[PDB]
Amino acid sequence: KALPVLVVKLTHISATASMAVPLLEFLSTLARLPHLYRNFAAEQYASVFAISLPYTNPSKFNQYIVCL
């Protein structure tokens, strides 16, 4: 019940290296828990990609961060 609001709230976090590993670990552990996001609407998924897309940038983020 906290997830639909939670994923939105994580988008408000600025993309910094100190946050890259926790956010991506959270999203990757969440992805492997299908019973949690079974009722995700489009806004929730859009939040997920909004959190993880900034971390796909090797010009700013470590290669492990980018691969993850």
């Binding site: 990757s28 470590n62 492990y64």
Partner: protein, 397 residues
Amino acid sequence: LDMMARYVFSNFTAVPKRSPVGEFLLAGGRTKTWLVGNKLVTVTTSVGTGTRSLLGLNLAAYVPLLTQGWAEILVRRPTGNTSWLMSLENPLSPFSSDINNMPLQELSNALMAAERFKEHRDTAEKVPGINPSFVFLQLYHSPFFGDESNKPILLPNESQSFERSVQLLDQIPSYDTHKIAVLYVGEGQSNSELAILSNEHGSYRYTEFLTGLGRLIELKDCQPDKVYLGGLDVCGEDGQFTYCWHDDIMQAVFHIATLMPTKDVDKHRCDKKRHLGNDFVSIVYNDSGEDFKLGTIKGQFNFVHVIVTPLDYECNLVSLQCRKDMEGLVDTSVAKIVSDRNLPFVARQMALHANMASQVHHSRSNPTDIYPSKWIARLRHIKRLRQRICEEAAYSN
């Protein structure tokens, strides 16, 4: 982008399963492969292959007429292979086929004209079979190409050193492959490399932690190409069973010391160490009541350890120890306390992220290696194959 183009409207696996009848009809078929951008479009067409026995059937004419529209288009891409068995709706032209005899029995058997079906029982200059370039040109040909970015490049069909390259691409998986060691440390084994590898059965909590790591795969019945065994012998040198953890994007396999047999011949348990010591990451089920130290298993690799310290009251403490060069990628300050019922999830996924970090670090110290991200490994293979063809063609002019 290739993944998005692959999964936006589908959830089909990254590896085709050619049907028994497809193999029968396309065995020894006429095949050609094109680079079309960073994709290998392969078309194969049927050479007949004695279809008369499959269908149980002018006698020398209607079967070859029926088969030569059957084809397979297989697109190898950075993210996987897609293929469709194909069958032309275009009949052979009565005005332009061979002028010896043109019976209408093809139309008489129109319902069988696509008798390739998903499941079947198949048995108790003059070269036949349409050129795969018919399917290719009909699908892909147009004037005014992007001169070098988009223009199709036929892989030299004659030189085996390129079929070898495509076979290498098929051996590069369409999913990241992770091999994770899992060790049991009993009482007093906190510093004994030999005792750790010599364990044949762990605590009950350890066994329940094993049962959650993924599906049990009986190695004897697992195909190495399809189910990632990481190096374990199919024939049982390394035990009847092991656990593996599958996803569309990745396959992780657990090399579990206790499941590997201990033979009297194997003194230092090198039959086990050959797997556990060559893995980047080990989940150490530290039942020794004493701080396990990284590097206790002396071998190279073993960059990160996921130390599972079982606590009282059905819970565990999971932490990471890593080599001083890996410490920039892996956070050793992790002390994730997790209950037993979710421990084989948390330690498993920590092992995955530790392994990804380790595979990336290994590339930094070993740049020439196949890239850890198997999608990028496929893409770099496709790029390198395309550039190699350009060089060899240039050397041929």
